[PDB]
Design a protein around this nucleic acid. Structure first.
Ligand SMILES: [Zn+2]
Ligand SMILES: [Zn+2]
Ligand SMILES: [Zn+2]
Ligand SMILES: [Zn+2]
Lengths: 69, 1179, 116
DNA sequence: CTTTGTCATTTTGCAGGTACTCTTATTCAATAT
RNA sequence: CUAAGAGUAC
DNA sequence: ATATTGTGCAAAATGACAAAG
């Protein structure tokens, strides 16, 4: 849905690295492993936390708001 | 690449597959069948029959009115509109599916037909033939005859042409695939019904006791006619040792098995030699002639066509034909009931005689041990009726009902001389209600379960449901996975229950033909040299191939090779519809062509000589792959190159099970096409040592279905584990649709953080599994840690749960309408008051505001009222202690489920079709995993949580990593789930390197390479890690298998199963506890539980269970008659049995109330179960 | 058995005893057509049948892609290539002897040993 | 002449145990008071 | 409430 | 305008029926 705040296994905060991760993938044309290493994700628990995330909230944001102010 | 005509590689075929799934989609068969039905089948149903002629004779007592009238009604073209809804106020507006779903409407569109009412008149002159003329009243005027429900995304739906942005605007998930109907706001899917094909001759050996040894039968049927089933059977009487072996045929509407020769002479073939030529095509086959002599000896007594016709007519079961007209009667039976699929016209007696000779020839071949009896399980002999044909036959019946009603109304009004009105003639409610009833409830009529509620638990669950086939349940073995099921249905996806094998799922690339008119192919055959059957004489053309089209022997050909070559060329260039299947059996010298609907087929690469390279090669080359890649990349300017382009240029072919008998398929191109130190880690493969291939598999992994395509490394698992995972992934919890927030579904479950698998297959990116995942990558350790994961239990990390592992949202929607019990007895949504309401529930009404609905945001618990409704009743009644005329309202509120609780997410208020207000209340709660919840890997390794440990108590590696899950080692060896271990290793490598593991089944990925990559990353090559005990910090003597693994949270949670009952509601009839946990019911103490208690010898406990725990009833009997007919006034202390006239010979007994009911039911059935309290005989 | 039909009405002919010459004589049962019997045999019954094992052989049997190929000697062409298949007599007790068709001369030869 | 055993039909009663959820539907239409 | 049906767990 | 009435075993039982006195 949206990037988890912390890694499930160890508890490292990875919710502040999603935008940096996407920026590294897109702007710098780094492959996933090097981007994950650059962000500081060394244990493969954190690496799977960020690597396998599916950002469904974007799809949710396409529908018009139910209660629009 | 650089070379345009270079051969493709095994990696290139996925491009082809992508193109296929770009043009077809996952539910192509549903939409195709429905579009075929709407475009052509409706018009055929309307035009067939549906010309109501009523000839009102003059009935002239006097010649002054000797005029005979003839009123005819005919139906012209049929118009089907876009889906629209009526309204209480009468305004009609367009209806969209995400209004039908919310308002419980039916996504249906009106049907109109152009009715032409003609009237003819004739002068009624006796003797003179009547001549009818128009009166110039040629009135014509479309009329509404009902509503056809529309399947979503079909050609007649609003969403067919919608783009992604439009779908988002219309509140429709772009991932939704359609292929289902909306009936009363419920999504209904039509399961493909399997049946045996028609117009196919099948020969079967019979059992020893029966006097008939072999039976050759055809289930003849005609698509463009009345669609009636007439079963012809040709039977060979007498066992092998018997001497009088006579062949007899079973004609319809005949009470006896007529000998075959009598039929042949009736059709017009008098000489014995001509009959034998019609049956046996070889003079040298004297065995068949010897076996056939008894039949002609039997029919020697008839030597004339008229005589044989009379013989048949005498046997006629109608028994309403005079002696002279029996001939005509027999003729009629031979013209309109014998082999209907050939023709219903006359002058084709030769064709039917030839077909009968062919059936007898097949039967004799089976009896002469020259061929085996036909396999009933051969999948090419089966057909799948999809939404198209099912709705076709249902609508045919329903429209026949409506037109019969029209004719009856017209006859009644002309007899009674009343005026005629079309609006009072047509009752659109007939068609509308019939279709709505058939789709709303599974029963397909006026079979069961034909239409089912679409499964929306998970995206893959919906995909699997939309491709499901059911076989209604002979001497066959239908449950087995047949050889012919290869590439058409999933080898491992079927329920474990009674439906095992009967319920099947389509392969990924399998499609069902929708049927085409065979006339163009017949014209092609006639033009290309097919000799007509009428002037066919077998002796002058012995080695002639018999050409069949849809089971109709149309003629013979003398050069079948050229005919097959040109037919293949025509189909490959698109001149013949690709769905048409053409089989050439060289040994039997036959050529069959099938164009009918329901045939299941799959696509394959075409292989030709390719003289340039001097060896067989695929027709597809790198240039076509490049064009497909370019088109795909453009979609994500060049000429578009789609799957249809591959089809048209003769690059890929559609093959069904029947044609698949006559081809050779290469498993993979790169290894089997080219003419012929190996890695020991790779699996062993055989070159087949044969180079005559005609086709190549696009990819072997395409033999799997939707659910099996999710399994990582399915070829490294025991097959039952694959079946278990296929069944269990539909229960996986994920995100079923992206618009779940605007749907008021009854139940919905969502993961907080769905994750795509680290080990993923190539086929799952056509299933959108990476976009809508149904699981999470948990760090799993295989260890005997604490003994709390024995016998399939699991240890889950409590700290992982605290941080959001496998957490879920759960939505439940309660619906409530206000109904008109009378013209002014409307129900009212309100907040009922104890002062003036009856039977108000014990829950709190305080959370309702003044419209009778809780407002979103309020926390609700079990038994609290969420919808407040009252119904008016008749006042001025006094009872119950506190019932007065003020209590004119009876409570009809809806409380929240007893066990459930949560936050009211949303409430929706609207009006129904009738215009009455109704509401839907959706309540949201959070399911957090706990002890007893069920989780499973993708390999059938199901298990519940035994216990949860916090992070400090879990074992840890030198890097501080702790597992999310610990599973027992003992689950591995017996089950042989090697794929689980391989997927864990591959996931560890992928997580370390940042790539994605390619866990496709039949790739050349070995554990050796994964181990080498893992070693390069700095870990032990086999996945073992030195772990430390959490409690003491000491090194564990054994190293632990450790790594990420994809797990699904299943729908079975312990909080939805826990249930206990001390005392509660009792059933009204038997005074026993009610059934079900939703009703606070009691547990069944079955028969064999009683048997176990008997074996234990605990009699008092058994009595206590059956009497004090369920139903103990004290009843009175008298000592004279053992009946319970004792009037007992306990307060007055007066007992009396009328009849016996006694008042002191009474006893009371404690018996189960079910026993008292049984004795009373025996008495009501005229039996006296007299009960006596003392012995009258010695033991 | 080599049955024959009447040439007058195309009906079956049946055996008949003769007294003047004591010879077998085939006669029609409806038009009384009479002729001599070519052979004294009038009935054959095969308990163990050998024919039908090679049934379905056609001049284009080699065009079948499902049939397996072989390089065994053709004892009329000495050619390598040929197609082969097992006995077509579907009795459950038949032998597994193979039959071969040369794609050049269309000579059917078996892999049997006792017969040779 | 009636048994007499004998096959070939007719009945004919059955078909694991618990448990959970949801959906629909309760005779249609014409006539007479 | 009753009934029928469908799906499912061991 | 609304109530009222137009399925596959497999054992058991049974019947038909060529031989026997
Ligand atoms: Zn971590
Ligand atoms: Zn009494
Ligand atoms: Zn003759
Ligand atoms: Zn040869």
């Amino acid at each position: 849905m949206i990037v988890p705040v912390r890694c499930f296994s160890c508890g490292k905060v990875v919710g502040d690295k999603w935008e940096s991760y996407l920026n590294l993938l897109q702007e710098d044309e780094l492959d996933e492993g090097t981007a994950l290493s650059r962000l500081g994700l060394k244990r493969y628990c954190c690496r799977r936390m960020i690597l396998t995330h599916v950002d469904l909230i974007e799809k949710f944001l396409r529908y018009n708001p139910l209660e629009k102010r | 690449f650089e070379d345009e005509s270079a051969p493709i590689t095994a990696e290139d075929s996925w491009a082809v597959i992508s193109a296929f799934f770009r043009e077809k989609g996952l539910v192509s068969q549903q939409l195709d069948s429905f579009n075929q039905f709407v475009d052509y089948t409706l018009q055929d149903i309307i035009c067939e029959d549906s010309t109501l002629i009523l000839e009102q004779l003059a009935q002239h007592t006097t010649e002054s009115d000797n005029i005979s009238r003839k009123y005819e009604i005919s139906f012209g073209k049929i118009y089907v509109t876009k889906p629209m809804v009526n309204e209480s106020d009468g305004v009609t507006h367009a209806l969209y599916p995400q209004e039908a779903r919310l308002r419980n409407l039916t996504y249906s569109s009106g049907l109109f037909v152009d009715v032409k009412k003609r009237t003819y008149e004739a002068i009624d002159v006796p003797g003179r033939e009547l001549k009818y003329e128009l009166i110039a009243e040629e009135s014509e005027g479309k009329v509404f005859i009902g509503r056809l429900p529309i399947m979503l995304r079909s050609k007649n739906c609003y969403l067919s042409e919608a783009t992604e942005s439009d779908l988002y605007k219309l509140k429709e998930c772009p991932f939704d695939m359609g292929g289902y109907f909306i009936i009363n706001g419920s999504e209904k899917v039509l399961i493909a019904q399997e049946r045996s094909a028609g117009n196919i001759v099948q020969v079967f050996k019979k059992a020893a006791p029966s006097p008939i040894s072999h039976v050759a039968e055809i289930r003849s049927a005609l698509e463009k006619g009345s669609r009636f089933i007439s079963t012809l059977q040709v039977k060979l009487y007498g066992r092998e040792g018997s001497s009088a072996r006579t062949i007899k045929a079973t004609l319809p509407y005949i009470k006896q098995d007529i000998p075959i020769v009598i039929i042949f002479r009736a059709l017009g073939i008098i000489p014995d030699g001509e009959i034998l030529e019609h049956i046996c095509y070889d003079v040298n086959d004297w065995q068949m002639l010897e076996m056939l002599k008894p039949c002609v000896e039997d029919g020697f007594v008839i030597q004339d066509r008229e005589t044989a016709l009379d013989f048949i007519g005498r046997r006629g079961t109608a028994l309403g034909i005079k002696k002279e007209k029996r001939i005509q009667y027999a003729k009629d039976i031979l013209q309109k009931e014998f082999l209907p699929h050939i023709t219903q016209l006359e002058g084709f007696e030769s064709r039917k005689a030839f077909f009968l000779g062919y059936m007898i020839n097949r039967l004799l071949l089976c009896a002469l041990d020259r061929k085996d009896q036909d396999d009933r399980d051969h999948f090419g002999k089966k057909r799948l009726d999809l939404a198209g044909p099912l709705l076709a036959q249902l609508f045919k019946t329903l429209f026949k009902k409506l037109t019969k009603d029209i004719f009856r109304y017209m006859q009644r009004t002309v007899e009674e001389a009343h005026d005629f009105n079309m609006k009072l003639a047509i009752n659109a409610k007939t068609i509308t209600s019939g279709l709505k009833y058939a789709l709303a409830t599974g029963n397909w009529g006026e079979r069961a379960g034909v239409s089912q509620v679409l499964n929306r638990y998970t995206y893959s669950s919906t995909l699997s449901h939309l491709r499901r086939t059911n076989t209604p349940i002979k001497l066959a073995k239908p449950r087995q996975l047949h050889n012919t099921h290869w590439g058409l249905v999933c080898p491992a996806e079927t329920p474990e229950g009674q439906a095992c094998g009967l319920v099947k799922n389509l392969s990924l690339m399998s499609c069902i033909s929708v049927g085409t008119d065979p006339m163009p192919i017949i014209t092609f055959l006639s033009e290309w040299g097919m000799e007509p059957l009428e002037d066919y004489v077998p002796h002058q053309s012995p080695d002639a191939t018999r050409v069949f089209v849809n089971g109709v022997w149309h003629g013979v050909h003398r050069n079948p090779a050229r005919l097959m070559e040109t037919l293949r060329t025509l189909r490959r260039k698109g001149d013949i519809n690709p769905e048409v299947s053409m089989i050439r059996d060289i040994r039997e010298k036959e050529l069959k062509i099938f164009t009918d609907a329901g045939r299941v087929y799959r696509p394959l690469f075409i292989v030709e000589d390719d003289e340039s390279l001097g060896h067989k090669e695929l027709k597809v080359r790198k240039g076509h792959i490049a064009k497909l890649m370019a088109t795909e990349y453009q979609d994500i300017d060049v000429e578009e190159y789609t799957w249809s382009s591959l089809l048209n240029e003769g690059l890929v072919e559609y093959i069904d099970a029947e044609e698949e008998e006559s081809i050779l398929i290469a498993m993979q191109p790169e290894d089997l096409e080219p003419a012929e130190d190996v890695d020991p880690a790779k699996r062993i493969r055989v070159s087949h040592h044969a180079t005559t291939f005609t086709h190549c598999e696009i990819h072997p992994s395409m033999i799997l279905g939707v659910a099996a395509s999710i399994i990582p490394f399915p070829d490294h698992n025991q097959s039952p584990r694959n079946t278990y995972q296929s069944a269990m992934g539909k229960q996986a919890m994920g995100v079923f649709l992206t618009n779940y927030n605007v749907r008021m579904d009854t139940m919905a479950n969502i993961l907080y953080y769905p994750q795509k698998p680290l080990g993923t297959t190539r086929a799952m990116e056509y299933l959108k599994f990476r976009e809508l995942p149904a699981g999470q990558n948990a760090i799993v350790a295989i260890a005997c840690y604490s003994g709390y994961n024995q016998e399939d239990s699991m240890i889950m990390n409590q700290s992982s749960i605290d941080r959001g592992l496998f957490r879920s949202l759960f939505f439940r929607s309660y619906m409530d309408q206000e109904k008109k019990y009378g013209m002014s007895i409307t129900e009212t949504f309100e907040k009922p008051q104890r002062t003036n309401t009856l039977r108000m529930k014990h829950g709190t009404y305080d959370k309702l505001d003044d419209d009778g609905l809780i407002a979103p945001g309020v926390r609700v618990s079990g038994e609290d009222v969420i919808i407040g409704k009252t119904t008016p009743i008749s006042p001025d009644e006094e009872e119950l202690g506190q019932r007065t005329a003020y209590h004119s309202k009876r409570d009809a509120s809806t409380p929240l489920r007893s066990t459930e609780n949560g936050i009211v997410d949303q409430v929706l208020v609207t009006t129904n079709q009738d215009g009455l207000k109704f509401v839907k209340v959706r309540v949201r709660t959070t399911k957090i995993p706990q002890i007893g919840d069920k989780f499973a890997s993708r390999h059938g390794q199901k298990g519940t949580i035994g216990i949860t440990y916090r992070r400090e108590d879990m074992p840890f590696t030198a890097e501080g990593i702790v597992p999310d899950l610990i599973i027992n080692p003992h689950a591995i060896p017996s089950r042989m789930t090697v794929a689980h271990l391989i997927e864990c290793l591959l996931s560890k490598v992928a997580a370390l390197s940042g790539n994605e593991g390619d866990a496709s089944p039949f790739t050349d990925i070995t554990v050796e390479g994964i181990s080498k990559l893992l070693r390069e990353h700095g870990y032990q090559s086999r996945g073992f890690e030195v772990m430390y005990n959490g409690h003491t910090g000491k090194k564990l003597m054994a190293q632990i298998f450790f790594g990420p693994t994809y797990y699904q949270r299943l729908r079975h949670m312990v909080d939805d199963k826990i249930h206990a009952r001390a005392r509660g509601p009792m059933q009204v009839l038997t005074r026993q506890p009610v059934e079900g946990r939703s009703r606070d019911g009691g547990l069944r103490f079955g028969e064999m539980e009683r048997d176990c208690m008997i074996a234990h010898g605990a009699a008092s406990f058994l009595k206590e269970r059956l009497m004090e725990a369920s139903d103990a009833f004290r009843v009175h009997i008298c000592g004279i008659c053992g009946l319970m007919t004792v009037i007992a006034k306990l307060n007055h202390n007066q007992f009396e049995c009328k009849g016996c006239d006694n008042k002191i010979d009474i006893y009371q007994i404690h018996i189960p109330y079910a026993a008292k009911l049984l004795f009373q039911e025996l008495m009501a059935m005229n039996i006296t179960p007299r009960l006596y309290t003392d012995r009258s005989r010695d033991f | 058995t080599t049955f024959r039909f009447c040439r007058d009405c195309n009906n079956m002919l049946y055996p008949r005893e003769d007294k003047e010459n004591n010879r077998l004589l085939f006669e029609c049962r409806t038009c009384s057509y009479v002729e001599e019997a070519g052979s004294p045999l009038v009935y054959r019954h095969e308990l163990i049948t050998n024919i039908g094992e090679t049934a379905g052989v056609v001049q284009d049997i080699g065009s079948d892609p499902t049939l397996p190929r072989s390089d065994r000697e053709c004892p009329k062409c000495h050619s390598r290539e040929n197609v082969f298949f097992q006995s077509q007599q579907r009795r459950k007790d038949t032998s597994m002897v193979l039959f071969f068709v040369c794609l050049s001369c269309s000579h059917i030869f078996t892999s049997d040993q006792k017969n040779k």
